[PDB]
Design a protein around this ligand. Sequence first.
Ligand SMILES: [Mg+2]
Ligand SMILES: [Mg+2]
Ligand SMILES: [Mg+2]
Ligand SMILES: [Mg+2]
Ligand SMILES: [Mg+2]
Ligand SMILES: [Mg+2]
Ligand SMILES: [Mg+2]
Ligand SMILES: [Mg+2]
Ligand SMILES: [Mg+2]
Ligand SMILES: [Mg+2]
Ligand SMILES: [Zn+2]
Lengths: 211, 108, 287, 159, 148, 285, 152
Amino acid sequence: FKTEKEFMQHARKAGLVIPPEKSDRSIHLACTAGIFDAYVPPASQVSIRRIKDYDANFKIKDFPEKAKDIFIEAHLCLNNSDHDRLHTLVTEHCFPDMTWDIKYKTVRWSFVESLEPSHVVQVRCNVYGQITVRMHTRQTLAIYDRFGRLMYGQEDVPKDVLEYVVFEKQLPYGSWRMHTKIVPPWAPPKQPILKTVMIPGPQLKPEEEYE
Amino acid sequence: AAPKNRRTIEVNRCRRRNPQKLIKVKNNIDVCPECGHLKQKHVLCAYCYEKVCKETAEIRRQIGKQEGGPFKAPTIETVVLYTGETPSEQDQGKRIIERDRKRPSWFT
Amino acid sequence: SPTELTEMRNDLFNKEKARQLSLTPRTEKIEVKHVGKTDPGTVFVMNKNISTPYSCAMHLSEWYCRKSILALVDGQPWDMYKPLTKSCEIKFLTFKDCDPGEVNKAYWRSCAMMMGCVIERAFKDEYMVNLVRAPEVPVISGAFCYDVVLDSKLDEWMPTKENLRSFTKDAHALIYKDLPFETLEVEAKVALEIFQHSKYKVDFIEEKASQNPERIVKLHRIGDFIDVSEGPLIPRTSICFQYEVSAVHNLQPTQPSLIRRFQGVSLPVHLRAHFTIWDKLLERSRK
Amino acid sequence: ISRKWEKKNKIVYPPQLPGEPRRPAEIYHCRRQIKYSKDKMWYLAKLIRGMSIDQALAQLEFNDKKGAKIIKEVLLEAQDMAVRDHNVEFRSNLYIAESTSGRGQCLKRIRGIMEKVYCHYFVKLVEGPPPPPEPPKTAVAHAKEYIQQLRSRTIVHTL
Amino acid sequence: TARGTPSRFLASVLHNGLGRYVQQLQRLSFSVSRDGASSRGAREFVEREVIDFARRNPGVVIYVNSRPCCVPRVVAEYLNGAVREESIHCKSVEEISTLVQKLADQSGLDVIRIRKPFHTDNPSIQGQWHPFTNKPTTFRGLRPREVQ
Amino acid sequence: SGTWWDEHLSEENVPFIKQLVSDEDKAQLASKLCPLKDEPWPIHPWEPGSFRVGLIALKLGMMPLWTKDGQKHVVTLLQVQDCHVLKYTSKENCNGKMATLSVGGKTVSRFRKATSILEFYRELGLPPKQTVKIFNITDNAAIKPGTPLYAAHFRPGQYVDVTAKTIGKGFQGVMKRWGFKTGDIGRVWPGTKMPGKMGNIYRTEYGLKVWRINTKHNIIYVNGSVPGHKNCLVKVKDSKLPAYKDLGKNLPFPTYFPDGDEEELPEDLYDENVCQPGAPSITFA
Amino acid sequence: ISHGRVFRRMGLGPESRIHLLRNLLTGLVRHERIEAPWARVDEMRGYAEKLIDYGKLGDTNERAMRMADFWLTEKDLIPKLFQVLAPRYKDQTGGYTRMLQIPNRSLDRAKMAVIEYKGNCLPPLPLPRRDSHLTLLNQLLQGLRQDLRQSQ
RNA sequence: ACUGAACUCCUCACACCCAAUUGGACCAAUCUAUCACCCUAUAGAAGAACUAAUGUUAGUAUAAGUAACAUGAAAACAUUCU
Ligand SMILES: [Mg+2]
Ligand SMILES: [Mg+2]
Ligand SMILES: [Mg+2]
Ligand SMILES: [Mg+2]
Ligand SMILES: [Mg+2]
Ligand SMILES: [Mg+2]
Ligand SMILES: [Mg+2]
Ligand SMILES: [Mg+2]
Ligand SMILES: [Mg+2]
Ligand SMILES: [Mg+2]
Ligand SMILES: [Zn+2]
C-alpha cells in the first residue's frame, strides 16, 4: 500500500476489524516534526528566558563553539559509521536523513579551518529548545561505493560550505543535538556527479500516446 | 519392465544437459521501428497489436451500441470517425461510428 | 619517413585531445532530451565535453548501440563517438530508417576513409603514395572513390586481380581489427600542423576551413591514420561486412600527374546482400 | 532455509587507489519460492549465462516456457537495483555472470504423496561487457599441447 | 594409499650436506600444564631432560610455555617454515625424548610419499642414451635406399 | 542474424532482381547451345568395352504404350530438363579405378545455394543444377565440362538402368516395411528386420527398355517403373546387365550433338515394335 | 503416410471440423477480423475466399444461396455477404483475406493468427513493411537498374 | 642357460594372515566420584559403538520431468453459433 487510508479501506473490504485498544504507555518522543519557525535567511530573548528557566547555566556566547563540536564530531562519526555516538550527537529526526542513504558506501568527510566564526542566528521554544546557527566552513568529501570507487567529490580539495544548522534540546538528561539543516532557496547547486543519469519518460501502455 | 539399477547423476547429467535438450538461442529478434519494443521477425509486434486490439475493442463496443441486439448486421459498409471530422463525400451511404478520442497517428 | 609521419601525426593528434579535455570546467553536466520517435521524452543528464551519443545509446539499451549509427543532434548529423557540447536533442539514425540519407552518406565517407587507410600502408617503401582526397560520390552512383597520386615509377602501373584482392584482404584485416573512428574538430592551424607534408590535403584543409565562420576542420583517426572528412563517420570499422576494392581508374586530364582514382563498394552488417546480388554490385562498381 | 545470496549485496569494499583499475559491480539478486521446478528452470537459467542483460531479456521474451517471464521479472528488477542502488551508470552495460536455480521448500499433497514443487532463481549480474566466448581450439593449439606433452616426459623408474 | 595422498621427490632444504650441515629445526614450543595428569610426562621432561636437550643443540630455541593446557603439545618449527604440531599427551619421559629427538633429527619436508629413493642432479656422466648412441654411421651420411 | 536474399529489398527492387537473375539464367543456358562451335575435346569412336555418360531426368509420370503384338507396356516418361556436364576428373586425380564425370540437372535458384557452390557454377558459367550425380566413365567418352546433354543421348531399343530415391513412407513397422507378422542367442543379430524408416533411399531398377524418345520436348519413354515419386530426379545410365554389354555400336558415343548438324533427328524416335499413334489400327493377320 | 493429404484433421470428426471452420468463417464474416489459432485460421482461409467466390455469383443464384445458407450460421450475415463483401471485392479476383501471426496465446502457448478481410473499416494491422527504397542496398540496386536501362 | 613366489637369503623391524569356538591386551562416547579447565586423568558404572534384519521413522534420489491429467468456438466477454 501507500498510506493508512488504503490499508483501512482494504481492511474494511476484507473484514479485518482492528480494534483501537487503550494502552497506558505511549511513545516518548524526543524530537520534533521539523522546525518551529522556518528561519528564512537573507528579539527572541523571550525564548532565551524560556530556556534559562529550565537550564539555568547556559551562555549563548559559548554556544556556537559548542555547536561547532556537536557538528564536526557528528560528521566524523560518519567516517567510521559509529551510530551509537550519533544518537548522543544528533536528533532522531536527523539521524535517518544523514545515515540512511550513506549506508553500504564509505564516506570520508573531513573538516578544515573555518572561514568565518560560527555564530548563532535565532532561538525558539514537553519543551523543545531550538537554536539555528550559521556556519561558514571548509570541508572535504569523498563518497565511495560498495565497490570503493569514487562517486562524489575530490578527497583533498576543500570546499566552502554554508550551514544553517538547527539544533534542538529536550527541556532532564538531553543535550543540544543537530535537529535539521536549513538549505535556503537561493543556494547554488551542489557539486556535480561523476556519473551520468538517464531519466525515463512516461511508460506508455498501448492505449495511450506521447504528446 | 522395471529398471534393473538406478541411473546415476553422471548418466543423467549427460542426458538432460546435452544440446538436444537445451534451449536454442534464437535470432529472429528485432526492434519494432514504430514502438521500439523488440519484436520477432515474421510475427507482428505484441505491443502494436495490443494498440490495434484495444481500438478494435472500443470500436466494436460502439458497433454494438448502435446496432442494438443480435441479428443486426447492416447491408452497408461502415466508417469509423473521430472527434472533429466531417464524413467525406466518399463516406456517404455508410454507417458512422463516432468516437470520443483523437484520430490516431496510425489509423488512416 | 613514413613511421615518423604516423608517429608525429598521432602525437599532434594527442596534443590536441590533451588540450581538448583540459579545458573542462570540471564536469559540467548538460542535459539532452531524447527527441525521438520511440522511447520518447527521456533526458540524459550527461558530462559536458566527455560523454558522446554512444553513451546516451548505452543508457537506453544494447539495441540502440548496435543499431544506431549517426545522431541527429539538433537536426545535425553527429558521430557516435564525438563528445557532446551543450544541452541539445538527440535522434539516433540507423540504416533501416524511413529516409536514411545522412546515414548512407556517412557510411560512404567512412568506407572511402578506410580505403585510404588500406592504400597508404599497401605499397612497398620505395614508392611514394599520396592521397589527395575522397570526393563525395552519390550512393546511387555505384562506388565510393578515393583519388590517389602515385609515384613516377608507377606512372604506367595497373594492378592485376590479385593486387585488388590483396587490397581487399588488407581491408578485411582492417575491419577485423574493430577500430573506432576518433574525431576531432580542430582549428586550421593545428590541422595544417598535422598534414604539413602533403600539398593536396593542405589545400583541402584550406578550402574547408574557408567554409565555416571559425577555422574549424574535422579530423578522423581509424588507427594510426589521420584524414580529413567532409562530415560525420560510422562509429566502427566493424560495421562494414562486405567490402571490396573493385577497380582502379586513371583520370584523363592529367598533364601534371595522374589523379588515379580507386573504386570500391561495401555493405554493412545490417544491409547484407546475397552473393549473386553482391556480384552484380561488384560489376556496376567498375565504371 | 538459508538466505546467503541476499546478503551478498551488502559487502562493502574499502575504497580504491588512483593507481588501480576500476572494480566492476556485482549485483546479487534472487527470487524464492517460484512455483516451478528446479530442473525446468535449469534450461532457462542455463540459456542466459554469459549474455548481456539485453540479450537475455530479448531471448526470454519469446520463449514459451513459464519460467521465462519470471526470470524476466528478476532481471528487470535487478537492472533497476543495478542502477538505483549499486551505482551502475549504464543500464545496458551488464551481463549475467551467474544464473542458477535451487530447489525451494516444496509442499506435499496427499492424494499417494505428490509434491508441489518450488524453486528459487539466483542471478549475479556483473557490470561490464559480456566476456568473449571461448574460441574452439585450433590445430595449432592441439599440436602445441601434444608436443608439450612430448617435451614433458621423462625416463621413468630410473635415476 | 599413494593415489589419494600427494607425493614428492626426495630433496634437501638448501643442499644440506654439501657445504656444511645445518640443523633444520628452529623452534620447539612445549606447553605443559602445571596441575594436570596428561602433562605429567611433560613435566618430568622439563625437569629432567629439556636442559640437556637444549645444550646438545644450541641452534634450537626452545619455549616452554606452561599454561593450563588440557592436552600438552610440542610445536616444532623448521627453517623452511614448516610446522609440525605433535602431542606429548599421556606419554612417558622416554617416549617424549624419542619424539623430541625424532623432531630434531628430521627436516621440514613433508612426510608425504617420496617417489624415488634417490635424487641425483647429474645422473649421467658418460652422456645419457639417445637412439643414435650405439649406432654406426654411414659414408656421407646416407640413409637406406639413398642412391647418391 | 541470418538473412535471406529478399529481406532488405524494397517493393521496387524485388521483381527487378527476379527479372535480372532469371534473364542471366536464360542467357547462360542459351550460351552453351553450341558445344562444337566452341572448342570441345577430341571425339573418339566407340571401342568395345567403353562407357559413356548418363543423364538426370525428371519423372513425368506413366502412360501406356501398345506394341505390335497387342500388349500393354506401362511406360514412365522422363524429361531431361537442363542437363549439363559439370566437372571431369581423370582417374589419376580420382584415385578410383575409372574416370568420372559430374553431371547435374534442373536449374535451381541462385538465392538458395551455399557460396562454394555458387562460386563453382560462377566459374563454370552456369545456373546451378539441383542434383549432381557422378558417372564412372572411360577416357574415350569425356565431353568438356559445360555441355548440354540431351534426350537423344539414348536411343530406342537401348536398355537402361535408372536409379533414384524411392518414395519415403516414414517410420513404418514390420508388416508394411518387411512384410511379415533365438532364446540361446542372447542378442539380436545385425540386419534384423525391425520397424524403422521405410523408403527415402536410393534404389536402382536394372535393365529397362527405352521405347520411344521425344527429341522436341526431350522426353525418354522407358519400360516399367522407376523409383521415385513424380517430378523426382533420376540418374539414367546405360545398363550394366551382362546380356547388354556390347550394344554401344549404334549409340552416339561421347553424347548426341545437335550442334554437329549431321542427319538431324525427327520429333520422336520410336522402337520398331511400338505401335505409333497415327498408324492405322493394327491387325494381327 | 500422408502424401498429398491437403486437409487438416480437426475437431472430433470430419463433420466437426466443418462445423469448427464454419464457426470461424461466420465469426470473420461478422467481425471482419479474427484472432484464432493458426492451423484453424489457414484451413478457414481456404474456405473463406471460396465463399466470396460464391458471393460474387449473385444473390439471385440458387446454388450460392444454398452455400451461404450452410456456411453462415447467423442468417443476418447472408445479406452482408451478398451486399457488402461481394460488392467490395468485385474488382480483384483473389486474395480477399490477409493472414498474419499474433504472438502466442498466453493460455496454452498456441501458434496464433489473424485473418482479416482486406479493406475493412477496422483499425489497420501493423503490417510487415518492405524496407525503404532509400536505404543503401536499395539505392545501389536502383543505380544498377539505371545502368541496365542505359543499355538501350 | 634365463625367467619365475608371500619359499629362502639380504638391510632394518618383528606380538602383527584361519571357520565356529576360546584366552588376552587396549579402548570411542556418555554419566558418577575426585582432578582438570581450549577437552583431560584414575576409578566406578551403563539404554556403552551398526556397511546388512523384504528392519522402523524421517529426508532426498532413481525410473522421470516419464505415465497420466485438463478448457466446444468467435466476440463487444454483453452475446451468438455448433
Ligand atoms: Mg486433436
Ligand atoms: Mg625374483
Ligand atoms: Mg582417550
Ligand atoms: Mg573412563
Ligand atoms: Mg545399544
Ligand atoms: Mg554385517
Ligand atoms: Mg536397515
Ligand atoms: Mg510435458
Ligand atoms: Mg522411458
Ligand atoms: Mg502421454
Ligand atoms: Zn511494435
